[PDB]
Amino acid sequence: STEELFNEYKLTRPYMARCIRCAVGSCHSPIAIEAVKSDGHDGYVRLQTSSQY
Amino acid sequence: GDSITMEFKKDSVRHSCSVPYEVKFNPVGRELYTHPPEHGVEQACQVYAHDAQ
Amino acid sequence: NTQVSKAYVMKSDDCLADHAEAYKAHTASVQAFLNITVGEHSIVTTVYV
Amino acid sequence: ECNIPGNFMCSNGRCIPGAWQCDGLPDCFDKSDEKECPK
Numbered sequence: 001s002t003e004e005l006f007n008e009y010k011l012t013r014p015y016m017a018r019c020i021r022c023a024v025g026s027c028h029s030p031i032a033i034e035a036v037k038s039d040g041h042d043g044y045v046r047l048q049t050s051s052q053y
Numbered sequence: 054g055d056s057i058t059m060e061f062k063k064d065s066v067r068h069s070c071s072v073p074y075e076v077k078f079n080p081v082g083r084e085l086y087t088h089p090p091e092h093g094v095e096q097a098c099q100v101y102a103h104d105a106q
Numbered sequence: 107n108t109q110v111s112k113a114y115v116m117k118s119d120d121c122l123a124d125h126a127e128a129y130k131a132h133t134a135s136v137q138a139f140l141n142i143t144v145g146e147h148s149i150v151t152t153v154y155v
Numbered sequence: 156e157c158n159i160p161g162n163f164m165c166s167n168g169r170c171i172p173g174a175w176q177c178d179g180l181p182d183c184f185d186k187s188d189e190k191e192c193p194k
């Protein structure tokens with residue numbers, strides 16, 4: 001229902017990026033977090049990761 | 054942290070053990086960081102080798 | 107070998123809702139709401155000073 | 156470099172325990188720690 005739920009996801013595809021520590025050292029993992037915003041007053045976090053879901 | 058807790062799952066109720074020991078690692082360099090940065094300069098340090106040698 | 111790094115500063119995506127607005131103000135005017143009754147004539151008056 | 160010494164450099168440059176070099180597990184994720192392993 002609607003392109004917002006259809007999503008450009010079909011065009012994008014998740015990708016991988018470097019993490020500082022992957023446990024034992026760095027690695028090129030898709031879990032990598034690009035940016036984090038913390039402006040909401042209720043304590044919720046908005047994380048932007050390199051993968052999609 | 055202030056203490057170290059180690060645990061593992063047996064064939065029954067999980068077992069754990071905590072011992073009091075001060076854990077406080079000195080950041081490498083003249084800058085006091087919590088986790089290593091994504092980017093930086095290479096400086097000499099002393100670390101525990103994982104090699105069984 | 108050559109590795110070119112490029113970076114720039116851009117507004118945050120949250121800025122649209124969470125932002126500060128810097129204003130300059132001068133020459134202020136006062137608007138008053140007086141309840142004026144003149145000879146059993148009760149009215150609600152919105153009038154400047 | 157890495158946790159000197161012991162960190163066997165993989166083909167992709169990752170560092171693994173030297174006890175996991177030629178142990179029958181794909182720790183580099185590209186099989187480079189388990190290739191060319193002597194008998």
Ligand SMILES: *[C@@H]1O[C@H](CO)[C@@H](O)[C@H](O)[C@H]1NC(C)=O
Nearest residue numbers: 140141142143147148149150
């Ligand atoms: C004055 O204003 C209040 C509410 O604005 C109103 O209830 C009241 O009747 C008024 N009194 C007179 C004398 O007009």
Ligand SMILES: [Ca+2]
Nearest residue numbers: 175178180182
């Ligand atoms: Ca291995």
